[PDB]
Amino acid sequence: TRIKKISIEGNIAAGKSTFVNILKQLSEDWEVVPEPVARWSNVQLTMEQKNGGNVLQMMYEKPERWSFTFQTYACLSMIRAQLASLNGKLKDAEKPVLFFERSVYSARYIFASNLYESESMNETEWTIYQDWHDWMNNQFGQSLELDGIIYLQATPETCLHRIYLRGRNEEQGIPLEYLEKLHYKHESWLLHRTLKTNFDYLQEVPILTLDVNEDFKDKYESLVEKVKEFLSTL
Amino acid sequence: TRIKKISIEGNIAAGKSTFVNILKQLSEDWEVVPEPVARWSNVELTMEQKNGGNVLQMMYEKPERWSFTFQTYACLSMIRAQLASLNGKLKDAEKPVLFFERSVYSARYIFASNLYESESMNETEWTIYQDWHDWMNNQFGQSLELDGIIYLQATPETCLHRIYLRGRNEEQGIPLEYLEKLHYKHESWLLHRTLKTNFDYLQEVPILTLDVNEDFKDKYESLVEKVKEFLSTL
Ligand SMILES: O=c1ccn([C@@H]2O[C@H](COP(=O)(O)OP(=O)(O)O)[C@@H](O)[C@H]2O)c(=O)[nH]1
Numbered sequence: 001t002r003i004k005k006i007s008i009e010g011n012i013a014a015g016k017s018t019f020v021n022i023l024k025q026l027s028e029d030w031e032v033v034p035e036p037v038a039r040w041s042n043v044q045l046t047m048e049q050k051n052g053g054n055v056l057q058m059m060y061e062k063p064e065r066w067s068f069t070f071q072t073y074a075c076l077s078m079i080r081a082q083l084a085s086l087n088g089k090l091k092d093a094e095k096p097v098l099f100f101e102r103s104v105y106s107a108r109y110i111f112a113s114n115l116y117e118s119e120s121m122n123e124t125e126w127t128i129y130q131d132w133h134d135w136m137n138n139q140f141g142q143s144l145e146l147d148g149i150i151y152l153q154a155t156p157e158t159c160l161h162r163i164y165l166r167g168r169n170e171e172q173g174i175p176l177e178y179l180e181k182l183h184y185k186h187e188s189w190l191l192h193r194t195l196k197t198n199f200d201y202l203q204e205v206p207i208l209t210l211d212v213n214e215d216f217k218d219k220y221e222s223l224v225e226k227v228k229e230f231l232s233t234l
Numbered sequence: 235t236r237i238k239k240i241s242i243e244g245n246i247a248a249g250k251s252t253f254v255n256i257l258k259q260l261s262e263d264w265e266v267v268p269e270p271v272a273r274w275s276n277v278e279l280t281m282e283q284k285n286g287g288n289v290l291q292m293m294y295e296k297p298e299r300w301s302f303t304f305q306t307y308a309c310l311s312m313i314r315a316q317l318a319s320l321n322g323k324l325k326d327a328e329k330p331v332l333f334f335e336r337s338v339y340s341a342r343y344i345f346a347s348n349l350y351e352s353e354s355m356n357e358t359e360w361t362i363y364q365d366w367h368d369w370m371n372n373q374f375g376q377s378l379e380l381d382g383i384i385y386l387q388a389t390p391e392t393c394l395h396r397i398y399l400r401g402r403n404e405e406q407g408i409p410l411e412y413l414e415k416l417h418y419k420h421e422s423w424l425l426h427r428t429l430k431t432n433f434d435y436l437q438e439v440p441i442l443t444l445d446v447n448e449d450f451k452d453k454y455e456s457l458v459e460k461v462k463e464f465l466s467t468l
């Protein structure tokens with residue numbers, strides 16, 4: 001595909017959304033697909049939004065009951081939104097790039113996995129979920145396949161302070177220990193590459209790692225210089 | 235696709251499995267897609283049989299916990315089996331017909347809808363399922379639109395007797411009233427055609443209704459004859 005798909009990965013509150021919104025305004029050839037759940041949190045009634053708010057809340061409230069339904073619905077929504085941009089926007093750009101906020105791979109290997117490990121999914125649920133993921137991406141994950149990943153690396157402490165700054169009410173109870181786990185998985189996947197997945201191409205996929213421990217809100221030029229560099233090599 | 239697609243629909247124990255297996259043998263040009271969920275009940279490997287067998291058994295003990303999960307996997311199981319058969323055979327057939335045991339339509343508008351109406355999925359589970367169902371079918375199931383439907387129509391009382399004939403343990407407690415609901419559901423969809431769906435073409439699909447109250451296992455020729463005539467119109 002002429003559209004380059006680039007995913008932006010990283011822990012809770014690392015600055016993935018902040019970084020994606022930065023990128024979007026820098027190039028007519030650059031488009032972004034935000035992740036689904038972020039929209040689910042705010043208020044100020046589309047169907048995905050009603051479902052999404054409700055299931056978000058049930059998850060927070062009773063994880064061992066709703067993890068499966070939540071993760072399945074998050075992935076559907078993400079896939080449908082990624083496929084929709086990939087089919088709709090960017091059409092007359094000469095070097096078009098679609099940046100995904102997270103990806104189906106991180107959804108399964110970071111989030112869905114920690115849920116199985118947390119006992120929030122039972123064995124049957126985990127394996128139903130992986131099977132669905134498998135079949136459905138081996139139909140669709142192909143036009144979805146990534147040309148590269150960008151890893152936004154912040155420490156848990158950094159990430160915890162940023163949950164605080166964001167101040168989203170239901171998140172203020174997430175403890176350090178939880179982010180240390182998600183941290184470890186990201187490093188396992190994107191740094192040490194010791195993580196094994198079904199998707200064989202992912203082992204060779206180019207990765208750019210950006211340390212984002214320092215606020216980059218009004219000082220992000222150097223990061224972007226790094227991204228443009230990375231993009232010219234795929 | 236060059237292959238004609240015909241669903242076999244009917245209340246529980248109306249005889250769909252039975253007929254499908256008769257139809258199988260009749261022509262080299264006729265192939266069948268079995269409905270994933272009976273193989274789940276009986277007592278060797280398969281990850282889907284293992285998953286489905288657990289999910290079905292969990293369904294039986296606590297439907298309000300497991301209905302949404304069961305229905306998702308049942309429906310995934312269906313699309314993949316109907317897509318696999320669509321791809322893998324009747325390539326050398328002069329007059330190819332693939333018979334689907336049940337359909338993604340009955341699974342949703344008959345059975346899932348029943349689970350909701352019985353309070354085994356809440357509104358979000360049901361709204362999520364419907365969203366998921368539309369998309370799983372729109373994006374993946376476009377080659378599975380039906381050319382026809384064959385309705386094996388039997389009285390709630392035929393099916394109760396047939397459930398008693400089949401002697402599946404779990405199923406023996408099934409009441410007539412459950413069957414009547416499901417029967418009226420079938421009647422509205424396929425006879426009256428008052429059941430409105432989210433699938434435009436379906437309102438237009440030709441429907442053959444067959445009386446299967448009289449045993450047909452050793453005496454199926456007039457039934458097959460009506461099938462052969464029906465098919466000729468399409
Ligand atoms: O360099 C940064 C990165 C982000 N944030 C803040 O950290 C919070 C969470 O960031 P974001 O929503 O981007 O995190 P994500 O969950 O998308 O990774 C937000 O209030 C940001 O404004 C910040 O102040 N400086």
Ligand SMILES: O=c1ccn([C@@H]2O[C@H](COP(=O)(O)OP(=O)(O)O)[C@@H](O)[C@H]2O)c(=O)[nH]1
Nearest residue numbers: 246247248249250251252396400449450451
């Ligand atoms: O004409 C018939 C149809 C079937 N049955 C029996 O009735 C039960 C219900 O049949 P089937 O499994 O085909 O029903 P379905 O798949 O519709 O639930 C089974 O034990 C069949 O062997 C029968 O004795 N005569």
Ligand SMILES: Cc1cn([C@@H]2C[C@@H](O)[C@H](CO)O2)c(=O)[nH]c1=O
Nearest residue numbers: 012035037071074107111112115
């Ligand atoms: C994005 C995502 C988040 N989570 C959890 C649930 C979310 O409330 C929180 C960050 O938004 O992390 C998952 O379990 N799976 C996911 O796919």
Ligand SMILES: Cc1cn([C@@H]2C[C@@H](O)[C@H](CO)O2)c(=O)[nH]c1=O
Nearest residue numbers: 271293294308341345346349405
């Ligand atoms: C085939 C099927 C069966 N069922 C239920 C599940 C079982 O409790 C019973 C079969 O004996 O019917 C569904 O809810 N949906 C289905 O699609």
